[PDB]
Amino acid sequence: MDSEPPSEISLKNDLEKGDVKSKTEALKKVIIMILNGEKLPGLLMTIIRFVLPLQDHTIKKLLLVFWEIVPKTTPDGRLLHEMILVCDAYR
Amino acid sequence: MRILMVGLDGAGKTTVLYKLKLGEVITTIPTIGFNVETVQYKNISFTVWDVGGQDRIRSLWRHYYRNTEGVIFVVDSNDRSRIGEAREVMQRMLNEDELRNAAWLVFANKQDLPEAMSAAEITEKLGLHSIRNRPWFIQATCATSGEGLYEGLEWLSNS
Secondary structure, eight states: OOSOSSOHHHHHHHHSSSOHHHHHHHHHHHHHHHHHOOOOGGGHHHHHHHHSSOOOHHHHHHHHHHTTTSTTTOOSSSOSOTTOTTSSSOO | OEEEEEESTTSSHHHHHHHHHHSSOOOOOOOSSEEEEEEEETTEEEEEEEEOOSHHHHTTTHHHHTTOSEEEEEEETTOSSSHHHHHHHHHHHTTOGGGTTOEEEEEEEOTTSTTOOOHHHHHHHHTGGGOOSSOEEEEEOBTTTTBTHHHHHHHHHTO
């Protein structure tokens, strides 16, 4: 997904699927559309839900990636708190 | 079947989960995070998300709401100071659109303790009678003995 700004409905579906690869790919697809500068908050609860505690680095690294380029803007699955869904289980 | 089990810290959520999964009473630590496990009961495989109840984590439950078929809300029946707080958490949880049709099962837990509030008392304090929009049930439990646990899984499976 080079740059496709309407694809956020499919990404939500792909983000949790019971297959780790699909989830990683989805979250990756979100990153590439934001970096170009395209739509991203719809997904947030889905994105945040699988990855949170785990020591399994790749999804964690992917989520960690998305928190330095848009964390502030996206708020469906995060909202505003001191120990946000950016860092609460990332302790 | 997808299940979300929450409640305030120390209610007994992880004790419940690992009693169900291992038939064992484990020595818990506060859960900073979740535990997720699959349990077989009578041809149903329940995937239970036990999400820690301390404040930081409490702020995160909303990410586990979506796709939830049923909600286990664990209450420490012996703690009277925090019952109002439980009531407050649970009431706005009931207002959550992703939790809209999910089956609501309250566990009044630590029923084994001498001064534990009764399930009826708890039902009045949590305002359970006022839920008309979906299925609810309250069950007295003791997670250490295992009492009431499977009666819960039973009720849940009949959603």
